[PDB]
Amino acid sequence: TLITEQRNPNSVDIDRQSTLEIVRLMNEEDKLVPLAIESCLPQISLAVEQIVQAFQQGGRLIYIGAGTSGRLGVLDASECPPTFGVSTEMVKGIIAGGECAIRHPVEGAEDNTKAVLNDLQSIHFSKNDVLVGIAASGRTPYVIAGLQYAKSLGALTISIASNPKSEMAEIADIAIETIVGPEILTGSSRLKSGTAQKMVLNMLTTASMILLGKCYENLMVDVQASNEKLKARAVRIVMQATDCNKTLAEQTLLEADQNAKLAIMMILSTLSKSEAKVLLERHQGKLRNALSK
Amino acid sequence: LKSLSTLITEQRNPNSVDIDRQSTLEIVRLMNEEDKLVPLAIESCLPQISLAVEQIVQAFQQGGRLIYIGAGTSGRLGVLDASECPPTFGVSTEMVKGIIAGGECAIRHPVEGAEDNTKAVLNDLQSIHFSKNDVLVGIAASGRTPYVIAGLQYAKSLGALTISIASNPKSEMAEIADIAIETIVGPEILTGSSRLKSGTAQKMVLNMLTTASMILLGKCYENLMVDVQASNEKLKARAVRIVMQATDCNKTLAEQTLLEADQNAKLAIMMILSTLSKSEAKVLLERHQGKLRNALS
Numbered sequence A: 001t002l003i004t005e006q007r008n009p010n011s012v013d014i015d016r017q018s019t020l021e022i023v024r025l026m027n028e029e030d031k032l033v034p035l036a037i038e039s040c041l042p043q044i045s046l047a048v049e050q051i052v053q054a055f056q057q058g059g060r061l062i063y064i065g066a067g068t069s070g071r072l073g074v075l076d077a078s079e080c081p082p083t084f085g086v087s088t089e090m091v092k093g094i095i096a097g098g099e100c101a102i103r104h105p106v107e108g109a110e111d112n113t114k115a116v117l118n119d120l121q122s123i124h125f126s127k128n129d130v131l132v133g134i135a136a137s138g139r140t141p142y143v144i145a146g147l148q149y150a151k152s153l154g155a156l157t158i159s160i161a162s163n164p165k166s167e168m169a170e171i172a173d174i175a176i177e178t179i180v181g182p183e184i185l186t187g188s189s190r191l192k193s194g195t196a197q198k199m200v201l202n203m204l205t206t207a208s209m210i211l212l213g214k215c216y217e218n219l220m221v222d223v224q225a226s227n228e229k230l231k232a233r234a235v236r237i238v239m240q241a242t243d244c245n246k247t248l249a250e251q252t253l254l255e256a257d258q259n260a261k262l263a264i265m266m267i268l269s270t271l272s273k274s275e276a277k278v279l280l281e282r283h284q285g286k287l288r289n290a291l292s293k
Numbered sequence B: 001l002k003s004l005s006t007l008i009t010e011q012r013n014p015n016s017v018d019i020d021r022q023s024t025l026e027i028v029r030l031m032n033e034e035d036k037l038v039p040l041a042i043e044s045c046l047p048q049i050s051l052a053v054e055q056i057v058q059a060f061q062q063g064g065r066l067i068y069i070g071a072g073t074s075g076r077l078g079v080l081d082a083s084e085c086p087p088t089f090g091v092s093t094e095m096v097k098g099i100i101a102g103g104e105c106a107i108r109h110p111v112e113g114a115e116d117n118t119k120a121v122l123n124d125l126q127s128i129h130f131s132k133n134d135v136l137v138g139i140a141a142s143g144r145t146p147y148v149i150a151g152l153q154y155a156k157s158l159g160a161l162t163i164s165i166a167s168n169p170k171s172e173m174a175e176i177a178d179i180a181i182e183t184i185v186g187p188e189i190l191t192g193s194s195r196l197k198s199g200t201a202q203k204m205v206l207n208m209l210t211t212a213s214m215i216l217l218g219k220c221y222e223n224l225m226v227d228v229q230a231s232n233e234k235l236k237a238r239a240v241r242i243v244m245q246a247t248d249c250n251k252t253l254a255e256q257t258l259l260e261a262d263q264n265a266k267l268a269i270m271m272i273l274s275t276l277s278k279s280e281a282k283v284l285l286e287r288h289q290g291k292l293r294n295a296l297s
C-alpha cells in the first residue's frame, strides 16, 4: 500500500513501447525528482545547520542504509576527503552487510537489526554524531533499529524516505520525505528514489562543508590533488583567487604542501607559511574571515 | 592550470560566486534549481540514448555483456548501476559489469593516479575477457580522463561497440566512441565538483541504459518485472506475488501454476492468461521473443 510499491499508470504499456518512448517516459518522470526535493528544502536546510553544529562539536556525519541506499551513502561520503580535505572519519557511509555489500548482495542484511547495533558500536557512534537513515520504503528494519539506537543515545537522527509518515520518519528528529511518485518499473526504488537520495545527500555534505569554510567563493580550495586534472585545478584555483601567475601559484603550492587554501592565504597576506597556518587555524579554516581580519 | 578553462566542467558558476557567504537555505535552493537543469540536459540526449539502448539490446541477444568503465564518482556510479541488475532483473552477475579505475581500492576512496593510468585499463578489460561482442560504456564528466579514453580505444580496436557519456561537448571520448552521449549540465555549484550535476546525469543515463534494455528483452508484463525464477524460498514468495499482481489471480493458482511451469514466473503468467499447458505456452512465448503481451495477441 506504500507509494514506493505502487504501479505507475504512465508506464503500464512500457512492455510494448519503442526504445525512444521508454527513455522519454523515464526522462519525464525524472523531472519530478527535483520538484519533489523542493518540498523538502526547509527540512534539508535544518538538517545541514544541525550537521554543521555537530561538526563544530567534534561529531561525525554517519550514513546508514541497505542495498542501493547504503551504496549511495558510501558514494557521497567517499568524495568528502578529496573535495573538502577532511579525514575519512568525518563523513562515514555504513552499509548493511559490510564492505562486500557495496557490489554484492547479503541475504537478510536489510532485516538484521542485530548487525546495525554492531556496525554502529564498532565505530563508537556517540551522542555527538549525526545519523542519517536512508531507505526509500521508510521501513527497512536495519535502518529502523539504527535510528532507534541513535535516538536512545541522544544523537540527532535524520531519515530520508519516499513514503509519507514512515516509521523511520516517526523515530527521527528530522524527516526528509522525497515523494517522487510510483516508479516506472514497479518497485524499482533505485530509479527516482535513488536519484532523490543522491540529490539530498549531495546537499547535506556540500552545503555543510561550504558553511564550515571548506571552500572560498566557489572554488574548491581544499581539494586533495591526487591526479593530473586535480593538480592542474589546484594551480588554477590559486590563480583564480589571487590573480597571480602560474609560476607563483606552483611555487606557493609547493611551499604550502599542495594546500591551495594555505597558498591563497600566503599570497593574499604576504605572511609566511607558519603565520598563515596560525591565522587560518584561529579562524577555523575560514579563509574569508582569516583575510577579513 | 592547463586547458581546463576550455571545459564547462571546470568553469565557474556565476550563481555561486558568493556561495561561501550565502545562507544555508540559499545554498540548498541553488543546488535544487541547478538540479532541475539535469533532466532537461538529458532530454536533448534521448535520441543518442535510444541508439545506445538499441545497440545494448542486440549485444545482449548476441550473448554480449554491458561493461561500464570510469574513475572516481563516475566509476562508482557504473558499479552502483551494475550492482543492482541481478536482483532487479533476475539476471546473472556477468551481464552488466562495473569497472572502476584502481579496482576495489577506489570504491570507497580515491586511488592516487588511477584515472591517469592508461596501462591499467588494458589489464582490467582483459581480465574480464572483454571482447568484440561486448559493449563498453566509457563514463567521464570531463570527457578526457585518460583511463577511460584508453579503455574506449582498446574496445574500438577489438570491433566492440563503444559508448561515451560526458558533460563537455566535442570531447576526445566522443570522437573515439560510436555513440556519443553529451549531458551538458553546465558549471557545477562548487567549481569542478563533477560528483554533483554530472554525477546525477550519469546515474539517470545509466538507469535508462539498463532499465530500458531489460524491458526490450521482454522481462516485463505491463510495468511489472516478471522474469523471476523461484530457485529458493525468498524468490518463490516474490514470484507468487508477481504472478498474482500480473494476472489478478489468487495465491492458490499462482502457487500451482508456478509448480507446473518449473518455478518460472513469466511462463506461469503465460499459462494462466493463455489457458495453455506448459509446453504449448513455452512455444507461443518463444514465437514472440519472450514478450508476454505480444504473445497473448
Ligand SMILES: CC(=O)N[C@@H](CO)[C@@H](O[C@H](C)C(=O)O)[C@H](O)[C@H](O)COP(=O)(O)O
Residues within 6 Å of the ligand: A078, A079, A082, A083, A223, A226, A229, A230, B070, B071, B072, B073, B074, B109, B110, B111, B115, B139, B140, B141, B142, B143, B144, B145, B192, B193, B194, B195, B196
Ligand atoms: C573533483 C573531486 O575532488 N572528486 C571527484 C569528482 O567530484 C573526482 O574523483 C576523485 C578524484 C576520486 O578519485 O575519488 C572525479 O570523480 C574523477 O576525477 C573523475 O572525473 P571524470 O572522469 O571527469 O568523471
